[PDB]
């Protein structure tokens, strides 16, 4: 076929019910997840050619940067739950990786900060039980996939992304095979 299991897809040996229907990992540690968000636009290219009435997640995981890298993963919820992803994002990628000025849970802060979230409304998501059970949805959903890598992506809890067999030679093309590949495993 075209597209075949172990290709450009695998397939999870124990499906995951309920699950999200486009699921994604990754880490502002990971240097895939950098390359997948500044460079290749991933999630964005792939919602471009989701069909209608597809729900897109992002979560973030803990097995990268030990206490920081938990750190980060609550305040990714801090920022699902405010609805400030689009503008901590960056941010937080480049504080981590390219500047490396991000080494404590106050320099996350600092980017909140930056980004125009208020302090008391950024302490207050921070400490409240909402943001609590939404750090346990991200990683349950991990443990679901018994995920140890990122970046990763899932489609209805049975398959997932293998962009290790797509070509590289040119990243316009890498992401519309990925994007392809998600839509195709979609309709399956």
Known sequence: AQYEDGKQYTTLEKPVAGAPQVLEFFSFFCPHCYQFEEVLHISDNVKKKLPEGVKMTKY???FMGGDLGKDLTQAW???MALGVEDKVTVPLFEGVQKT???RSASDIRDVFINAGIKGEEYDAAWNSFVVKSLVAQQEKAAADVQLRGV???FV????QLNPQGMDTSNMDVFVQQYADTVKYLSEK
């Open 60 to 62: 973030h995981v803990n």
């Open 77 to 79: 919820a801090v920022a």
């Open 100 to 102: 490396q000025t991000i």
């Open 151 to 153: 970046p990763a992506m």
């Open 156 to 159: 209805n809890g049975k398959y």
